[PDB]
Amino acid sequence: GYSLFPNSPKWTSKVVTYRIVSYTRDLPHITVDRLVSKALNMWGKEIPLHFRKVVWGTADIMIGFARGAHGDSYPFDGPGNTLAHAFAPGTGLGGDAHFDEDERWTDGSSLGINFLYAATHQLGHSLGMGHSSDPNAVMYPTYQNFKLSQDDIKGIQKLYGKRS
């Protein structure tokens, strides 16, 4: 079923900050903001961790869109091939989630990669989830009405405990 990262890195503070740093031409900025919140809350409702949004500076989880090389060691590669990537909890690059601007992204009303699904998968990595062997899992390794699977819930609660 689920996996974590080696040595089970996790956020150990009660509050973790996040920032939407850069946007996509494909959607209104407000829509990206609302879908990012919804994705974080899918995972957050299950566990004792709280997320605080910031609008400037460095936050724990930096989220954004980029083309090509963008300051980490893993440049994007134009249309196709890698779509997005995210880093396990930790200082610096840890927690950050990046999306390739050279794809097409949608809120569900157009052609594109469904941004809510993709953000829920990437932010699973930002919280410490690896990939699952269960085809039903959001954390399965390969890509409109979804929720987290039982396997996704079991793994995140294994890592953080359950929310009371």
Binding site: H85, A86, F87, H125
Partner: peptide
């Protein structure tokens, strides 16, 4: 893609 660092 999940990356380590």
């Amino acid at each position: 893609x999940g990356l380590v660092x």
